[PDB]
User: Fold Protein HEXIM1 from Homo sapiens.
Amino acid sequence: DFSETYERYHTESLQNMSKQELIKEYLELEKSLSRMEDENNRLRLESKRLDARVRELELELDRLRAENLQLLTENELHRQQE
Amino acid sequence: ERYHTESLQNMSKQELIKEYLELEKSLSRMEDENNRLRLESKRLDARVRELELELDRLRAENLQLLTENELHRQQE
Assistant:
């Protein structure tokens, strides 16, 4: 809400909980984290697979671009000579 | 359940609160990092499509260039 004013309120709020409610609330917060982690791992693997594909595709585009370039200047020279 | 009876409760309440805060704080860095991971890997997906087309298009040009190189080859 306000960045520090909120932490103040929010920490009082945990202060006015019992230890056992805090342990309850917290055990849920872990649930949520190991769920997020898992998705992190899924997301990192999919990003790594896609940048490999971009990698491969980029090379072939280079491999081919340079082929075309050469050809193109061969076709100019061998054309004008006519 | 109770692997935690012991973990969280050797701790003082004040330690727990500390522990709960920092855990909130990293759930939150991680939602940001996961967001970035979702967006990035959808951009990279756009990318691949853009590259699959530039490739196709480059192949059409390669075929033309080659067929022309071949015409000239035959006129020699």
Summary: The radius of gyration of chain B is 30 Å. Residues 1-76 of chain B form one domain.
